[PDB]
Amino acid sequence: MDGVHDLAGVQGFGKVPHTVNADIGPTFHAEWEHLPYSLMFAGVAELGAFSVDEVRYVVERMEPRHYMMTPYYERYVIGVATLMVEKGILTQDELESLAGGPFPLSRPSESEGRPAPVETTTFEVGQRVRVRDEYVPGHIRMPAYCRGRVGTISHRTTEKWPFPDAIGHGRNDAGEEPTYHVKFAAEELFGSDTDGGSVVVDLFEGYLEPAA
Amino acid sequence: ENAAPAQAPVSDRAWALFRALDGKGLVPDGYVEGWKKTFEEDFSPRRGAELVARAWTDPEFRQLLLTDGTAAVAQYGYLGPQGEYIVAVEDTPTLKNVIVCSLCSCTAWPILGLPPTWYKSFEYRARVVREPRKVLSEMGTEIASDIEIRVYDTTAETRYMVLPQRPAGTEGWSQEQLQEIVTKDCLIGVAIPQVPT
Ligand SMILES: [Fe+3]
Ligand SMILES: [Mg+2]
Ligand SMILES: [Mg+2]
């Protein structure tokens, strides 16, 4: 999903609000902040109502301006609440009654997702690969800066996981694929307009193809 | 008009979510309290620090850490949620590694701790992939021209830690002394371990 969440490479932001080893305060800066992660895990592990990937996707589905003005942990409160409503566990009306006011949610999905790709290649370390030049309106774990770009395999995972584009929509056809550490030269991704050396993106097999 | 939607106070919304689920018997006794405790007390960059100090003093473990990070971490019992498949990345005299999750906040929680606010900022998420040298500089870490910066974007299930270079002036230090100078920021890759004057 080509949403505002896909921030890598966006220009115009100011300084990172940190200097190295500065005091970052306690883990949680307010008494509610542990709830989004805790209730996500309840949803995943106790209720079996959704996957972690569905949580990433529901946050991507926040209305764009809403996303941009919302603190991190609050995005997850909104996301988990949305999933609970979508899965029929809660109603928005009971959340608003309990909250004593408006509790706007993420926007409905505009894609049913897609299955794990039928045709993929097992790549080896050292091999040149291109990120498939594909556009996916639903959940995808490929940041746009690497779409269609060429890099070299530095690692093939020894474990396999469900394809996010499927499990992020709660589909039954996510299968399992390894991922690959694909190293791109900074100039491959940003031309002359970068000060870095290389970027390594951890990409599902189904996002990749042999390079020309 | 680009205006924010009307919203109840976030605390009221978060607690409403809790109460709605808890009121339906869907949250086990002490469930969120137990996670809060784990997040605050068990998931810690002190664990990553321990691993680095061990790697620094034990060539065999250093080799295991760099080849099968998961196995290495498992020896300490430090695998956990958002830290089940671990890859440690080695800094060298010609390579500085840095970790981000441009798409959200993905972090090796059990050994680095939950990400800090700044790591999750749009500033860090947008900028470090494209201008890591300038970003580290602004953050107080100067990386020379002769050093390649490599940014790992945490886009899937791999969960990364940086193994920084051991600084000169620490020869013969104990594992405890070495641990002390490996901070959260060293593990994320934005800082280099510092030896006192
Ligand atoms: Fe993330
Ligand atoms: Mg975009
Ligand atoms: Mg209404």
Q: Do both A90 and A193 map to the same domain?
A: no
Query: How many domains is chain A partitioned into structurally?
Result: 2
| Residues shown for chain B | 197
| CB-defined contacts A:B, below 8 A | 263
Are the Cβ atoms of A101 and B12 closer than 8 angstroms? yes
Rounded CA-CA distance A54/A84 in Å is 11
Are the Cβ atoms of B6 and A80 closer than 8 angstroms? no
Identity of the residue numbered B190: V
The residues placing their C-beta within 5 Å of ligand 2, an ion, are: A 2, 6, 144
Q: Which residue of A has its CA nearest to B106?
A: A56
Please tell me the number of the ligand nearest to residue A75's CA.
1
The residues placing their C-beta within 5 Å of ligand 1, an ion, are: B 101, 104-106
Chain B residues within an 8 Å CB radius of A100 = 8, 12, 16
Does A73 participate in catalysis according to the annotation? no
Q: Do both A104 and A124 map to the same domain?
A: no
- Shortest CA distance to A14 belongs to which of B188, B134, B52, B12? B134
CATH 3.40.50.720 given to domain B1-197: no
Gap from CA of A5 to ligand 2 centroid (Å)? 8
- Shortest CA distance to B189 belongs to which of B105, B146, B133, B144? B133
Q: How far is residue A195 CA from its own chain's centroid? A: 25
Q: Where are the domains of chain B?
A: 1-197
Structure tokens at A2: 């080509």
Using the 3D structure, point to which of A60, A82, A110 is the last residue of a domain. A110
Using the 3D structure, point to which of A86, A110, A134 is the last residue of a domain. A110
Q: Do both A79 and A157 map to the same domain?
A: no
Q: Do both A176 and A192 map to the same domain?
A: yes
Report in angstroms the alpha-carbon separations of A135 from A140, B71, B172, B174, B182: 9, 37, 55, 53, 41
Q: Do both A98 and A187 map to the same domain?
A: no
Beta bridge partners of A156: A180
Rounded CA-CA distance B81/A49 in Å is 18
Gap from CA of A79 to ligand 3 centroid (Å)? 17
DSSP letters, chain A, are ---TT--TT-------S--TT-----S-SSTTTTHHHHHHHIIIIIS----HHHHHHHHHTS-HHHHHHS-HHHHHHHHHHHHHHHTTSS-HHHHHHHHTS----PPPPS----PPPSS-----TT-EEEE-----SS--S--GGGTT-EEEEEEE-SS-B--HHHHTTT-S----B-EEEEEEEHHHHHTTS---SEEEEEEEGGGEEE--
Q: Is B90 helix (H, G, I), strand (E, B) or coil?
A: strand
Alpha helices in chain B (DSSP H): 10-22, 31-37, 45-57, 59-67, 69-75, 109-112, 122-127, 132-139, 175-181, 184-188
Are the Cβ atoms of A195 and B11 closer than 8 angstroms? no
Chain B residues within an 8 Å CB radius of A66 = 4-5
The number of C-alpha atoms within 13 Å of A211 and in the hemisphere containing its C-beta is 15
Q: Is B165 helix (H, G, I), strand (E, B) or coil?
A: coil
* Phi, psi dihedral angles at A57 (to 5 degrees): -65, -45
Specify the experimental method.
X-ray
Among B17, B102, B128, select the one facing A77 at the smallest CB separation.
Answer: B17
Confirm if B194 and B178 have CB atoms less than 8 A apart.
no
Are the Cβ atoms of A195 and B6 closer than 8 angstroms? no
Structure tokens at B57: 């003093």
Gap from CA of B157 to ligand 1 centroid (Å)? 10
DSSP B119: T
Do the bridges between strand A179-185 and strand B159-163 make them parallel or antiparallel, or are there none, so unpaired? Answer: unpaired
Structure tokens at B53: 């100090």
Q: Do both A115 and A98 map to the same domain?
A: no
Among A28, A72, A84, select the one facing B21 at the smallest CB separation.
Answer: A84
Residues of B marked as binding for Fe(3+)? 101, 104-106
Rounded CA-CA distance A48/A103 in Å is 24
Q: Do both A98 and A2 map to the same domain?
A: yes
CA B149-A126-A131 angle, to 5 degrees, is: 75
Beta bridge partners of B86: B159
Q: Do both A119 and A183 map to the same domain?
A: yes
Q: Where residue A153 sits, what CATH number does that domain have?
A: 2.30.30.50
Are the Cβ atoms of B123 and A13 closer than 8 angstroms? yes
Q: Which domain holds residue A23?
A: 1-110
Do the bridges between strand A150-156 and strand A179-185 make them parallel or antiparallel, or are there none, so unpaired? Answer: antiparallel
A contact test, residue of B1, B2, B10, B39 with most A CBs within 10 A:
B10
Q: Give A209 to chain B, closest Cα distance, Å.
A: 18
Rounded CA-CA distance B1/B12 in Å is 26
Q: Is B24 helix (H, G, I), strand (E, B) or coil?
A: coil
* Phi, psi dihedral angles at A52 (to 5 degrees): -60, -40
Q: Where residue A78 sits, what CATH number does that domain have?
A: 1.10.472.20
Question: Of the residues A57, A61, A75, A76, which is catalytic?
Answer: A76
Q: Give B72 to chain A, closest Cα distance, Å.
A: 15
Using the 3D structure, point to which of A110, A129, A158 is the last residue of a domain. A110
Residues of B marked as binding? 101, 104-106
Chain A residues within an 8 Å CB radius of B188 = none
- Shortest CA distance to A157 belongs to which of B160, B26, B28? B160
Q: Give A212 to chain B, closest Cα distance, Å.
A: 24
Q: Is B31 helix (H, G, I), strand (E, B) or coil?
A: helix
